[PDB]
mmCIF file of C-alpha atoms in Angstrom:
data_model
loop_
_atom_site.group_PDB
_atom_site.id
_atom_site.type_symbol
_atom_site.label_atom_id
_atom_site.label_comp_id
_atom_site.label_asym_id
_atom_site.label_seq_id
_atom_site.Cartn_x
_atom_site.Cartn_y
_atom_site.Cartn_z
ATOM 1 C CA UNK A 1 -16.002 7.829 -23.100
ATOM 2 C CA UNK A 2 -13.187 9.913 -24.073
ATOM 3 C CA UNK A 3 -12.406 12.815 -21.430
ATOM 4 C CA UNK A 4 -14.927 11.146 -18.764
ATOM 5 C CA UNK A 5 -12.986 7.761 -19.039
ATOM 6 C CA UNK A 6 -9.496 10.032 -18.272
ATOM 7 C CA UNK A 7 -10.812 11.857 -15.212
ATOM 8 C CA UNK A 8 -11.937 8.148 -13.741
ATOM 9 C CA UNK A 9 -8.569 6.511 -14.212
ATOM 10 C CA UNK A 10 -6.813 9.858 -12.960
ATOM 11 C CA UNK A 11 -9.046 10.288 -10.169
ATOM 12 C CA UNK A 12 -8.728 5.957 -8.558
ATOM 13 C CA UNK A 13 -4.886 6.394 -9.051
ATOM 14 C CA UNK A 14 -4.199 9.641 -7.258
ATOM 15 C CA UNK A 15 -6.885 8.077 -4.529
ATOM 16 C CA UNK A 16 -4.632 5.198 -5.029
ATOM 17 C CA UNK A 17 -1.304 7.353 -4.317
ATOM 18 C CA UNK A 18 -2.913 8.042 -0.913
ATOM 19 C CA UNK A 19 -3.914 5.223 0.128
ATOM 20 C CA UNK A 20 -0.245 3.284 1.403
ATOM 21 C CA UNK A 21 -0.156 5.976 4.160
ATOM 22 C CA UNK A 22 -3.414 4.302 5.806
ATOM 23 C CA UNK A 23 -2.161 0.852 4.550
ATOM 24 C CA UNK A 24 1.654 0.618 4.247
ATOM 25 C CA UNK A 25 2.328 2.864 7.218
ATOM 26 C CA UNK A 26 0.658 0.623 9.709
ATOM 27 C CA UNK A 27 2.253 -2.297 8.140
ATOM 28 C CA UNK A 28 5.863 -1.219 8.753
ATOM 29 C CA UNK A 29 4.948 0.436 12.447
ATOM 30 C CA UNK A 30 1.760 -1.531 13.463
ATOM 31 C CA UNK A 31 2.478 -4.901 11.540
ATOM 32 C CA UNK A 32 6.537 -4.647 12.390
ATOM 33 C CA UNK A 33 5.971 -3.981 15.976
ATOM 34 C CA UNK A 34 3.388 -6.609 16.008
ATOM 35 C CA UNK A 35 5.876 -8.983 14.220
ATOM 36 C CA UNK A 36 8.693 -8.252 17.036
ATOM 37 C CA UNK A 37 5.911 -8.892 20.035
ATOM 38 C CA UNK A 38 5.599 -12.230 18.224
ATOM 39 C CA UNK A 39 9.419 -12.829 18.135
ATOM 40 C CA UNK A 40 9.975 -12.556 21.702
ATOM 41 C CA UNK A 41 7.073 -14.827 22.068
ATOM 42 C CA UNK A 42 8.517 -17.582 19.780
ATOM 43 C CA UNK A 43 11.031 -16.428 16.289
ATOM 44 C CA UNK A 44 8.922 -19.561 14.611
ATOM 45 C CA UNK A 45 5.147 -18.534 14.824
ATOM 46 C CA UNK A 46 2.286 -18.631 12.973
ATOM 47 C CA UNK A 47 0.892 -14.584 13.337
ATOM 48 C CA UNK A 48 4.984 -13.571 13.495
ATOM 49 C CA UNK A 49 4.601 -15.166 9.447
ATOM 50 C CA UNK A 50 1.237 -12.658 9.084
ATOM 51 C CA UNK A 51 3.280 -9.497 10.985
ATOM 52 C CA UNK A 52 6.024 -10.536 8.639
ATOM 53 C CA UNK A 53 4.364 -10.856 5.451
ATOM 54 C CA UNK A 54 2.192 -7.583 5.921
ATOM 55 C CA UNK A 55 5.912 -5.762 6.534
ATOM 56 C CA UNK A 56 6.705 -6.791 2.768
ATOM 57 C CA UNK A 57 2.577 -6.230 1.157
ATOM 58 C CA UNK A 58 2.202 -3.219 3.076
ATOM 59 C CA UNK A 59 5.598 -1.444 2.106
ATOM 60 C CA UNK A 60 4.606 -2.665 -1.455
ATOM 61 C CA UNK A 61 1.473 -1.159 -1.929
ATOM 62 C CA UNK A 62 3.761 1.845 -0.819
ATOM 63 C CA UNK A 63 5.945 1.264 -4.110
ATOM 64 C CA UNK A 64 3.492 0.409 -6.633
ATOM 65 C CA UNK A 65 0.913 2.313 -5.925
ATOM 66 C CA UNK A 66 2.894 5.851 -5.220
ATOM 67 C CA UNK A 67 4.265 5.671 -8.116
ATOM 68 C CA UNK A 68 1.929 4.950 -10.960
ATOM 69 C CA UNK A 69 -0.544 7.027 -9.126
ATOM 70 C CA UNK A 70 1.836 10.139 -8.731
ATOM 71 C CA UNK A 71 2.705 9.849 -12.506
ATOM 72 C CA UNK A 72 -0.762 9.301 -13.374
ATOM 73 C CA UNK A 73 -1.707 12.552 -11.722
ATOM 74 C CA UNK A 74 0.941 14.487 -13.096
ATOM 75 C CA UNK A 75 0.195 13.384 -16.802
ATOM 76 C CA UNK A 76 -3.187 14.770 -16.944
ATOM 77 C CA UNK A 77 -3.440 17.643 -14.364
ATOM 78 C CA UNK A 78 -0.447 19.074 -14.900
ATOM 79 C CA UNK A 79 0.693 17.989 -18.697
#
């Protein structure tokens, strides 16, 4: 309700603040390499625009998620 409802929120964001360097980090190396495979192939294909578009979504569940997760952390662990 009240200090059970904090720890939850706290707790999925921090988990959250984690999570880009599964996700995000193989979408610049994996998903950029990938992308570049695809470009020597043909620099107009089809899974070149996935590669491509995970490059941008990956690195921005780096952003976003980092940091309101980091500052959501810091607000109620530390104070």
């Amino acid at each position: 309700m009240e200090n059970l409802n904090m720890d939850l929120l706290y707790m999925a964001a921090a988990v959250m603040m984690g999570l880009p360097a599964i996700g995000a980090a193989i979408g610049i190396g994996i998903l950029g390499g990938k992308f570049l495979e695809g470009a020597a192939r043909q620099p107009d294909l089809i899974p070149l625009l996935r590669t491509q578009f995970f490059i941008v979504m990956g690195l921005v569940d780096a952003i976003a998620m980092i940091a309101v997760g980091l500052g959501l952390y810091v607000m109620f662990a530390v104070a």
